[PDB]
Design a protein around this ligand. Structure first.
Ligand SMILES: CC(C)C[C@H](NC(=O)[C@H](CC(C)C)NP(=O)(O)CNC(=O)OCc1ccccc1)C(=O)O
Ligand SMILES: [Ca+2]
Ligand SMILES: [Ca+2]
Ligand SMILES: [Ca+2]
Ligand SMILES: [Ca+2]
Ligand SMILES: [Zn+2]
Length: 316
């Protein structure tokens, strides 16, 4: 809407206070005019019609329990925008500052979040499996990264291309979590998953096998569940990414870590210059090797480490 830019304050899902960019016109709306063509957060009101209504608040204070998922969806969308702009010189998901839209309070007891082709969508969880999912910065960045992927490589959401699609979202979700530098790790969704259980997560990039997922190509899922295992086989690529950044010896293959910034550069370049809608794991290896070559030279440690990592997870 048309209005004047303002700054509200509230608390997120985990009880942390933060400032948020709002817009005033009669009400204070969750509309951040400071980033591209805007970040807009909507209330789905426990229903499934999207986007719902642009979030309106009478006093610019967002401390109600009902407010918390909106505060975090809005704020973390901002952090993710900042990451892509400051780190990769990318302006929003389309590269041209497209408006970023999110809806919260989607459905009832909804244990998921997604990009629906046009916007981000967050459930509140059932209070047992999840608390409201926008409380996870890695989750918010995972979802916005699906938009980035769709506007770039366009990886089809099934089988190997779909598992790459998933891993790209987990990789950048994690890199955004490190960028914000609040309790960062290589786990996915730990801040919002199972409030009754401490120390667990939905997936692990450092050890995918701890949450049921393969860490080597020989252990790839080949059935039809989960669009041919897109959230399962992502473990193979997540492990490779983890090894490229942090190093390690995996099934006897040692990888020299080159750090998160170079991981990010290599995979961003692969995503935006080399991957296609039908790329498979082998093609991802080639894309990453070429990206590392472009950036650091064919005889570089960076190129050697990318090769080592894909070797370690059995992807040739
Ligand atoms: C138990 C759940 C959360 C695991 C898993 N979902 C996930 O890992 C993350 C959320 C997570 C980071 C918290 N959600 P996602 O974006 O990968 C769900 N994708 C999904 O919904 O894709 C289908 C779709 C395609 C086109 C339009 C609309 C929908 C899944 O869908 O299986
Ligand atoms: Ca209020
Ligand atoms: Ca964390
Ligand atoms: Ca995490
Ligand atoms: Ca937990
Ligand atoms: Zn996903």
């Amino acid at each position: 809407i048309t209005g004047t830019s303002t700054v509200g304050v509230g608390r997120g899902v985990l009880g942390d206070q933060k400032n948020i960019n709002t817009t005033y016109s009669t009400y204070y709306y969750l509309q951040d005019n400071t980033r591209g063509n805007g970040i807009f957060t909507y209330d789905a009101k426990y229903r499934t019609t999207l986007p719902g209504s642009l979030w309106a608040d009478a006093d610019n204070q967002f401390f109600a329990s009902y407010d918390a998922p909106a505060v975090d969806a809005h704020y973390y969308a901002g952090v993710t925008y900042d990451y892509y702009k400051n780190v990769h010189n990318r302006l929003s998901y389309d590269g041209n500052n497209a408006a970023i839209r999110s809806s919260v309070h989607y459905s009832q007891g909804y244990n998921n979040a997604f990009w629906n082709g046009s916007q981000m969508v967050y459930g509140d969880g059932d209070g047992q499996t999840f608390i409201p999912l926008s409380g996870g910065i890695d989750v918010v960045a995972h979802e916005l990264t699906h938009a980035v992927t769709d506007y770039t490589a366009g990886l089809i959401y099934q089988n190997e291309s779909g598992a790459i699609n998933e891993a790209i979202s987990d990789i950048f979700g994690t890199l955004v979590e490190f960028y914000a530098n609040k309790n960062p790790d290589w786990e996915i969704g730990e801040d919002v998953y199972t409030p009754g259980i401490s120390g667990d997560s939905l997936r692990s990039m450092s050890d995918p096998a701890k949450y049921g997922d393969p860490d080597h190509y020989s252990k790839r899922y080949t059935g039809t569940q989960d669009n041919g295992g897109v959230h399962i086989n992502s473990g193979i690529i997540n492990k490779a990414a983890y090894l490229i950044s942090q190093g390690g010896t995996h099934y006897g293959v040692s990888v020299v870590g080159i750090g998160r910034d170079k991981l990010g550069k290599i995979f961003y370049r692969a995503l935006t210059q080399y991957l296609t809608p039908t790329s498979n794991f082998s093609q991802l290896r080639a894309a990453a090797v070429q990206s590392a070559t472009d950036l650091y030279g064919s005889t570089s440690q960076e190129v050697a480490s990318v090769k080592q990592a894909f070797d370690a997870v059995g992807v040739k």
